[PDB]
């Protein structure tokens, strides 16, 4: 990018249209433009209900709102969970017999371990109320360092335009600790010193 | 083609009787061995019985030898394993399974398989 | 060229001693409009005529499957109770079942814009690589505003499927569109046929009967209206002949053809109706020729039999001895001869030997001329146009040259055979068929060569024509006398419209790497001697590391044959336990992302015990453990995946890369994918107009110059440390 | 009788060409052609094909059904009143 | 496909050593497992042991696990079967078997196969 010079010499007329592309900055764009999301993860206080007797047992809620005029069509929740945690298998069967939440045959069928991976499809996500799900989530092993699940709520005829939040029982908003100044960042996820 | 379910899993104590069934959809009087497969939590899915066509023939692992037995019904077309003295080391999940006959020790020629029971021990 | 239409690469090649391939190559920038790119190519002594080809250019994921949305016909009938049934089949790349949720919606395509029938959308699972959906006929009314069922007709349906994988690590969007609602399940057409008919002769419908998107039908009964006896049946090529009386006056032939399945009611039967005018003779003087060809459809190689047959007085007998015939094939004169015909001989039959230099069709033009009819010269002629089946003038098979009992592995030696003519040059392309997923249009077949030449020939009408300057001009010649007759003018260029236990270092994985979208772009020349003219060249080309079924199209380019587009060769590569990292195509610096490792397994019965693992990339941050690699302990059922999820923030822009290793317990295999993503810094890219001026050098300027100053560019949104790219355009304003 | 076809089967149609050398005093005497079908030995199909006066050759559109397996006589004749006035036959025959 | 040739069998004392060579003719990189099998007179043929593709991963049958070695030098496609301090059970035919690495612990996948070696050993 710096001047140029031209010298335009003979007879007849042109045009001279010249057009820098560059990056932008977005402003107001946190990506989540079309859905509202808000994930909460939070400690059962109960401590008795459960029958499995788990470690920790805390209970997830999900509450998703569409940004526009009307409401949204058959939504996809996809939640992938944290390491160790497993989601409650009776609500699952609670919240795939409502009458808006369908979760499939094959994701019910499957045991209470090795599924870390849940979707839920909504056939309605309202434009005026916060469409809200809670079920319980069981730690079935117990692990060093629990990684951050994330729930991802997009419409069925985008992948983009979606919004992804991430959830942790010790981090604000799921998101993993970082030195961050300028546009410049460090991880610090390590130990202290 | 089988259909093959097994029932008679629980949580038994130690030393104690356990009595597993299986029953088969199709017809049994065609397969030449039938077997069931333990698989513990933590370690792969190794042999601990094995039965004949016509219930002659019996193998079992060195490890349920003297306590296990298998034994074939043809009439309604399915299986059971009888176990006494119960080891602690024994919570598992078993599987019925049924095979052509060829090494009737080794799990991959037995090409029908069931989905498990579990089987617990508490000591 | 860009989508807007302005030329960003200009090239000048010379096709001289390089066997008529020219291999080029453009690397695209990254700063780009995204949509249908062309290019366009000509010759230099010809500049107005453009052959053109698309790509798109577009930011994109390879998917893991394909998705084929098929309704159980090919149409609708309106009257149908039971609506439209499509059945979505989700298949693997690499040929495998898919499980999974399908998303179905169904639209009115009306015209050139389309409508969607929000109600229609359903929801379905996917079991066993298959599902079934109904869009119901009540329904389809409700949704159109307009009352009745028979607007309907005309307006063509479309169907989206959007298949999401029980994973959901992967979604496949695909569209069946042109699916008409018509009242009739065939088509008839007549352009094939002869407009213009010789009274007196049988007259050959050479009827096209279609399935309504545009294929063509098969077993299809039709007949004349009035002439019952007249049925006739479709053949392979979708036209049958249907063999008529005409009767000796000078009358336009009305002929009216209708189906006669079986199966429909008589509301059901497609129908069209021909006005066909007579031959004119010169003078009225009764003197016709008959071209009669008994054919169906030919190989080349075979022969047939152009049947001769004179019409006149025999007042003017013994002065016909030769009927002139000419071959048109491709726009041009292929072989013209003289028929003996002796005296007495009312039909003659001239074999014609069908090589295979009449792929397309050909045009038989035959006449013969008269002095003592009435005291001058007459010509009389016919024509027909016979269509020969469109294949290779050479030959072109690839196929395996091993034995292919086994499936290949990713990186294994694969022995590729090609067999084709002597000496032709074989110019190869291998690609991902995800591609194909994602685009499907615009690739090159030898179908698509053979319908570019039969829009480029000169005939216009097949068969004949109104008088023997007519026949001359629809075959595409100019015949002239020295007595006077002559083809009339003919001025236009076209036709005209009518802990511990570390199972990953123990097992020292290198990691699948190459994951190329297309390869194999190789030139080869088949320079062994051939055996019965077909040359066999065996290829050891490497297979690339990715698990799914590569499309090896060739070209074989000789100098006595010609271009032969070969059928594409599917490789089918596949492991029974692998890793799929499911990466994005972008990700935005310094915000946090989850992507996934899809771990398959295949295995029959067992399940498998798999640690996998995320190596340490510092230009990621992650969890930072005692151990810097990031590892766990999954288990797989068997003939089922699992996602595995890995939350990181990037901290560097560029291609980083992301390494999954995974390891099986007690079996001796592993598998490990390295894959880069591009990080891209969290601006948006948008384009400002540094300036528009206009150039006028004797208005403009002094001296005959005009000095224009381009300024720097004046962005204050820029990110820092970012690229920018400032485009010059020059245009030449038309003055009139 | 012109039959220019390589393979037959049923259910296809078999245009057959009834091709006349005749000398035009005579003509408009003829109308018809007689066409008989000889398959396994005996009569199967026999018909007329009506011949306009002017027509020098006339196709007739045979169904082949599947009672013409194995073969067929397609065996065709015309009549009329010669120059010296006797009646006069003309047939030909092939075999498909 | 391979051809799989094994030499150095034949006489040895009790508590000596052995040295054998697995020679293949084709590519050794792309096998997954090769294992030594060995057969008694007048029994099966049962594991003894198994490589990895890399060498880093090693199994052993129970009775031979403190005596036996098995090594890969995928160089010149050799695998070698090393036992120190034998035994006079040990007296069997050993072959050489290329597998594509399931289930290494058992003969029904090691699709390629040698004639062996008669080892006796005497005591
Ligand atoms: C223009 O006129 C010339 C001369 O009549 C034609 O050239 C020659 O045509 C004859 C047949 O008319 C060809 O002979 C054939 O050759 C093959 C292969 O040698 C042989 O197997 C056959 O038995 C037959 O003898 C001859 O090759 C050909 N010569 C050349 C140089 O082409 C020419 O075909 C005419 N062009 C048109 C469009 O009519
Ligand atoms: C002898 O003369 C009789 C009548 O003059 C001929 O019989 C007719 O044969 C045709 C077939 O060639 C029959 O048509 C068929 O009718 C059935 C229903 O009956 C229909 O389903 C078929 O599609 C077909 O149209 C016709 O009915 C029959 N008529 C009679 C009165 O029997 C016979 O073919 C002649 N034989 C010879 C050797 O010429
Ligand atoms: C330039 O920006 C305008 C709006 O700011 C947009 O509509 C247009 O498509 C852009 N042109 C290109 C070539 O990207």
């Known amino acids: 990018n710096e001047g140029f010079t031209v010298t335009a010499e003979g007879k007849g007329q042109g045009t001279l249209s010249v057009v820098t592309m560059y990056h932008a900055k977005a402003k107001d764009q946190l990506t989540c433009n079309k859905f509202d999301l808000k994930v909460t993860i939070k400690p059962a206080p109960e401590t008795e209900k459960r029958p499995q007797d788990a470690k920790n047992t805390m209970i997830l809620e999900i509450c998703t709102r569409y940004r526009g005029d009307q409401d949204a069509t058959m939504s996809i929740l996809d939640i992938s969970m944290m390491t160790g945690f497993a989601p409650d298998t009776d609500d699952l069967k609670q919240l795939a017999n409502g009458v808006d939440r369908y979760i499939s045959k094959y994701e019910l069928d499957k045991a209470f371990s090795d599924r870390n991976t849940l979707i839920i499809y909504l056939d309605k996500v309202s434009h005026s109320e916060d469409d809200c799900l809670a079920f319980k989530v069981h730690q079935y092993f117990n692990v060093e360092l629990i990684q951050p699940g994330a729930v991802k709520v997009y419409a069925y005829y985008n992948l983009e335009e979606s919004c992804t939040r991430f959830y942790h029982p010790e981090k604000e908003d799921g998101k993993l600790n970082k030195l961050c100044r300028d546009e410049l960042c460090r991880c610090a996820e390590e130990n202290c010193f | 083609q089988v259909q093959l379910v097994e029932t008679g899993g629980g949580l038994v104590q130690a030393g104690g009787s356990l009595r597993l069934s299986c029953a088969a959809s199709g017809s049994i009087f065609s397969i030449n061995a039938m077997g069931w497969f333990r698989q513990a939590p933590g370690k792969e899915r190794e042999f601990v019985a094995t039965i004949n066509r016509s219930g002659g023939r019996t193998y079992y692992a060195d490890s349920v030898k003297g306590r296990f037995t298998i034994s074939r019904d043809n009439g309604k077309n399915m299986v059971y394993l009888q176990m006494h003295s119960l080891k602690p080391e024994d919570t598992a999940i078993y599987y019925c399974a049924a095979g052509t006959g060829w090494s009737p020790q080794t799990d991959c020629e037995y090409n029908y398989w069931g989905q498990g029971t579990q089987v617990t021990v508490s000591s | ?736």
């Open chain 3, 1 to 736: 060229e860009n989508p807007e239409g302005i030329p960003v690469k200009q090239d000048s090649l010379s096709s001289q001693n390089q066997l008529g391939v020219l291999p080029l190559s453009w690397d695209i920038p990254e700063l780009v409009n995204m949509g249908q790119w062309k290019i366009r190519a000509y010759y230099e002594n010809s500049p107005q005529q453009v052959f053109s080809t698309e790509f798109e250019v577009k930011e994109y994921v390879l998917p893991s499957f394909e998705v084929i949305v098929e309704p159980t016909e090919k149409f609708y009938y309106i009257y149908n109770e039971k609506g439209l049934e499509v059945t979505i089949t989700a298949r693997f790349l690499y040929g495998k079942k898919v499980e999974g949720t399908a998303f179905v919606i169904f639209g009115i395509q009306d015209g050139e814009q389309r409508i969607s029938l929000p109600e229609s959308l359903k929801r379905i699972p996917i079991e066993d690589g298959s599902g079934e959906v109904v869009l119901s006929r009540k329904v389809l009314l409700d949704g159109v505003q307009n009352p009745r069922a028979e607007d309907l007709v005309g307006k063509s349906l479309y169907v989206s499927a959007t298949v999401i994988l029980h994973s959901g690590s992967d979604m496949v969007q695909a569209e069946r569109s042109g699916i008409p609602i018509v009242t009739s399940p065939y088509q008839i057409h007549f352009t094939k046929t002869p407009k213009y008919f010789k009274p007196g002769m049988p007259f050959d419908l050479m009827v096209f009967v279609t399935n309504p998107d545009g294929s063509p039908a098969y077993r299809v009964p039709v007949a004349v209206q009035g002439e019952d006896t007249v049925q006739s049946l479709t053949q392979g090529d979708g036209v049958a002949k249907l063999s008529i009386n005409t009767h000796p006056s000078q009358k336009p032939l009305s002929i009216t053809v209708r189906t006669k399945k079986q199966e429909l009611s008589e509301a059901e039967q497609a129908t069209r109706t021909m006005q066909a005018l007579p031959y004119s003779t010169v003078g009225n003087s009764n003197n016709y020729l008959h071209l009669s060809v008994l054919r169906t459809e030919l190989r080349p190689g075979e022969t047939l039999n152009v049947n001769f047959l004179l019409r006149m007085d025999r007042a003017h007998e013994a002065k016909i001895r030769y009927y002139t015939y000419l071959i048109m094939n491709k726009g041009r004169l292929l072989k013209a001869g003289r028929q003996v015909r002796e005296p007495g001989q009312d039909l003659v039959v001239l074999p014609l030997s069908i090589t295979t230099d009449f792929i397309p069709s050909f045009r038989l033009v035959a006449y013969y001329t008269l002095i003592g009819a009435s005291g001058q010269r007459e010509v009389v002629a016919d024509s027909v146009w016979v269509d020969v089946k469109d294949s290779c003038v050479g030959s072109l098979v690839v196929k395996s040259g091993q034995s292919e009992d086994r499936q290949p592995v990713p990186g294994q030696q694969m022995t590729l055979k090609i067999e084709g003519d002597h000496g032709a040059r074989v110019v190869l392309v291998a690609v991902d068929k995800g591609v194909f997923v994602l685009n499907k249009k615009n690739k090159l077949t030898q179908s698509k060569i053979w319908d570019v030449v039969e829009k480029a020939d000169i005939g216009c009408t097949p068969g004949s024509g109104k008088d023997y300057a007519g026949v001359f001009s629809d075959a595409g010649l100019t015949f002239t006398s020295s007595s006077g007759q002559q083809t009339a003018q003919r001025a236009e260029l076209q036709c005209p419209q009518p802990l511990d236990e570390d199972i990953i270092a123990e097992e020292n994985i290198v990691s699948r790497s190459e994951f190329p979208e297309s390869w194999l772009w190789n030139v080869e020349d088949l320079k062994e001697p051939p055996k019965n003219g077909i040359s066999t060249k065996l290829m050891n080309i490497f297979l690339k590391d990715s698990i799914t079924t590569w499309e090896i199209l060739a070209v074989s380019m000789s100098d006595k044959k010609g271009i032969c587009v070969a059928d594409p060769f599917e490789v089918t590569v596949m492991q029974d336990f692998f890793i799929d990292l499911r990466l994005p195509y972008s990700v935005v610096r310094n915000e946090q992302v989850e992507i996934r490792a899809v771990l398959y397994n295949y295995r029959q019965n067992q399940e498998l015990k798999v640690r996998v693992e995320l190596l340490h990339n510092p230009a990621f941050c992650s969890l930072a453990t005692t151990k810097r690699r990031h590892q766990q302990t999954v288990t797989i059922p068997p003939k089922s995946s699992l996602s595995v999820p890995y939350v990181i923030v990037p901290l560097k822009t560029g291609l980083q890369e992301v390494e999954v290793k995974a390891a099986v317990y007690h079996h001796f295999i592993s598998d490990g994918v390295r894959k880069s993503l591009k990080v891209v810094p969290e601006g948006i890219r948008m384009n400002k107009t540094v300036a528009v001026r206009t150039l006028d050098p004797e208005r403009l300027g002094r001296e005959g110059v005009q000095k224009e100053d381009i300024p720097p560019a004046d962005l204050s949104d820029q990110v820092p440390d970012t690229e920018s790219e400032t485009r010059i355009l020059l245009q030449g304003t038309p003055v009139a």
